[PDB]
Symmetry: D2
Subunit: 311 residues, 4 copies
């Protein structure tokens, strides 16, 4: 009898709780397994469509969600009244989708908020007003899935980070990395140096230092799948960067769908997650599709990076 | 997006229900998948022990059960107060276990009752008093799993019978036979004719008639796994019998763990399920391990069988 | 590192052999796995068609076969000259196919013969003449697959019987039952007693004796899948019967596709396999689709059965 | 009926051939599947040991190999006389093994030579003399496996490159990428820029040019698994580099076990594969563990790289 994700979730709630969160996590597990099946058999943008359809179908039928936000879509979806729960969920169903052809890691990301007290959502207008009142610091849960040689699911509910691995023989996520802690330092950096010429001078200096300083040798790793690179960062330590550049002034990653959920996971594991001006989680949501640069990882590595920006 | 068992259960409950039954059925699905894994790899009893351990671990951690009864054990188990639900569940974790060596069907069976109103169970004594007040007609749910070349799960909640099949690629039970209806007649009988000499004379006459009547030709099938034989009976029609014998005066099958759950499924599919004196479901529970003979299946086939007894 | 079926076959041939048999067994393993995949996902006669297609496609491309005979087809198939080997293979791609709906055992069966020396086959006429010269005693290999909760492959090449189990994690058959020996006696019988009224009197007497004798209690098991019932018989012991009955004027099982391959397996495991007049393997093949009754299993159980037939003379 | 790797191999040999190569490829397929099983369940250097054991056991029992060379071992292994074939096989059983912990791509690589005519090998001394007479241009076959979200097997026998994917439902490699052709140009480069300060000046200039030239924008990808990075390079195009270090010692792959097999694949797909002085495949083998830098990929990308080296 191994410890399943479902068991872990049930145990970690107060005795005789409402159970909305359990149903939500059932729906997410199912979605992840359906996406994994499709990825395994790829050889024999279609994957994007399927992944989106799956997440929406299972989440809407869970009875747990009020509002759904998929990164691929322009508007939020409001659940129908009869099966309307109290969670707002924003997800990237399949990050790094081009990578499938070369058999490299891809991933899914989600962040979960709760309806503020004395608030209802009967339309997209209501939902738009509600998200403007929220911040990453109000997020009750976040997680991601990594589809590689194993399928991992990493999750937080505000009390640290736990990693699960899909046992394909029983179709259940099993606990394999309890209490993930990102090391305070580690000499690995992860960025696309192809964009060097577009970067801000302070960040060029930081990267040049990593390569040319006399004291500490650094290794570079850039898979080109944000989930894969962050997952490695969490377990090994290091830094992952999507810096500001001249062709993408507001940054690369979407706040709601990618950067804020990942920031919550990284902070809960003991790392740092910053944007252009402090913590990602402290930024206001003005826009459903707003963006930010990111500097994530081991807390002393992010401090060294910010020291070049400062001054 | 296929229809999962979990989705079916959630949809079939009132909007915003308590959700105890969903958690129970999650625990049962997980147990069935764990048992299937072990059966698939047999060779490369022990299976009885593992199967019992699995059912108990997942059911007790579901938060849905007050009291657990395993066929293999002398006493019922009371769930601890912090995670105590309102279902009484009696299960046979692995019927036909010897059959594994020859790669023939095996199965699991369960029946679920609810705490009567104004009743509590804080001990085995309480639980013993409670089951004496219950009958099969008070049973809220029943089901079985068949472990063969496919893994099937057949289930009722009082509104007919539905069959699911395990999709090993996603580890979910998928709906495959909605609204199972047992034919009113079919010329198949299922009994161990090796025990011929120990049977009551009326049942010898019935069996002799099936073989020697001039009007209707009958086929015999006896797998020797009760779940496998009942599963065939449900889908094809026919009759399944464990008649009274001179060496086993009170019958072979245990009422709570096997006969009553199977009787509820057979009745809900439109068949008949009788013992020595009428419906199995109408018998009083006096004893935890009490037994009964059974005559199950197509309603006209069971009527013909009872006509020999009545003469 | 577990012992695969392929490894077992390679090891059991003379050093630096031709290797036709290895390629044949690869093709059969592949066919079995493809059929298993389809059976596992049934629900979510189509199975018959797929199974037949699979066996033919993989066997013909193996380069090992001269002639193919599928139970479902009226004629044999001759491999094209460029990829023509020296094995004649007769197979039942999917026995008990109706059973799939109720999730009971199904199976595949095959028997392999070799071209007699100084013989060629360039047509169906040639192939028809060749099979008339052969008997079950000339069969070089036989096996079956059982598709249940596990997938088993049981095989003989004339030196006993070995059982393999499919490891779904690596897609290989692994050795699990080396040197299968059927017990000399065991009180289990397997027959469809629904057909009682159509049986010969001596066989009714035999069945009545199993039920009513004062000395030995017998259990009845009849799955209704020949491969499943035979597989149980091999491992537990007992008897399996498809006796002669008034409806069937020559018996139920086809000699080439089912009865002779199963007979070779049962004999190689230490049992007996008889028809209406002695060993199944000693019967002449007059007809591609000829049939026979069968009495298979533990040697003392088959002797008791034949004793009832002998006393009725 | 899909086209299996085994079928493809049999069809691609002359009618009624000896069949040694088929048995060899069976043994390799089995080894790859065994390694995949172990990788899938990681979590739930041990992998290195298991992988080595698997390759050796299955290859030695194939009857197809005369001599075995594993990258991990100091000496070659001679097959015992009774089961001695005519292939010399040099393999890296598991490249990138550390990566398993972070769920990133790993791989296996092999290259196959044939006994020269009128030559025998009854000892390690004989085998040592034989390899000194060979070059990469005499190699009869090469391939690799990539263990990611799918399991790929890419193979050449001197007539182009074909890619297969493992169907986990039937345990067979299925043809999915026939006739792989690497594009003549593509703006992707793959190197570890953490080693910048140890590189030769010409290669620093080349890398600086890729980042800062006014004409062509380049993307960087470095998974940190040689097989993963080469696999992407083959399918998408680009360049993969393990440059020579200024110290002339570091920045080298092993010729026999990694560089020459990968060079044969890249050339057969229409790319270029060069070392310090021309084609990898034209280098003489002076010893078993000899090394070389590599510049592999799209033919115009490798030409641009060599132009910086030339002046």
């Amino acid at each position: 009898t191994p410890t399943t994700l479902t068991q872990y979730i049930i145990k970690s709630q107060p005795p005789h709780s409402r159970g909305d969160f359990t149903l939500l996590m059932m729906a997410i597990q199912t979605s992840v397994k359906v996406i994994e099946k499709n990825i395994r058999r790829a050889g024999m943008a279609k994957l994007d469509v399927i992944s989106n359809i799956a997440f929406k179908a299972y989440l809407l039928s869970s009875t747990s969600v009020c509002v759904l936000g998929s990164e691929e879509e322009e508007q939020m979806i409001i659940a129908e009244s009869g099966r309307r729960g109290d969670y707002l969920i924003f997800f990237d169903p399949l990050d790094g989708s081009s990578n499938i052809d070369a058999n490299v890691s891809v991933g899914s990301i989600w962040g979960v908020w709760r309806l503020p007290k004395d608030t209802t959502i009967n339309s997209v207008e209501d939902a738009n007003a509600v998200i403007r009142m929220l911040k990453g610091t109000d997020m009750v849960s976040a997680g991601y899935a990594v589809y590689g040689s194993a399928t991992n699911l990493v999750l937080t509910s505000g009390h640290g980070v736990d990693g699960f691995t899909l046992d394909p023989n029983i179709g259940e996520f099993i606990l394999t990395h309890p209490h993930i802690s990102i090391p305070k330092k580690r000499s690995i950096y992860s960025v696309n140096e192809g964009n060097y010429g577009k970067w801000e001078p302070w960040f060029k200096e930081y990267i040049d230092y990593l390569k040319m300083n006399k004291t500490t040798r650094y290794s570079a790793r850039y898979i080109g799948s944000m989930v894969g690179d962050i997952h490695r960062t969490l377990l090994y330590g290091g830094i992952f960067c999507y810096p500001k550049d001249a062709n993408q002034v507001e940054g690369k990653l979407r706040l709601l769908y990618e950067a804020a959920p990942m920031a919550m996971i990284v902070e809960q594991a003991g790392g740092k997650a910053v944007g252009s001006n402090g913590r990602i989680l402290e930024q206001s949501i003005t826009r459903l599709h707003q963006r930010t640069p990111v500097y994530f990882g081991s807390r002393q590595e992010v401090d060294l990076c910010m020291a070049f920006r400062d001054r």
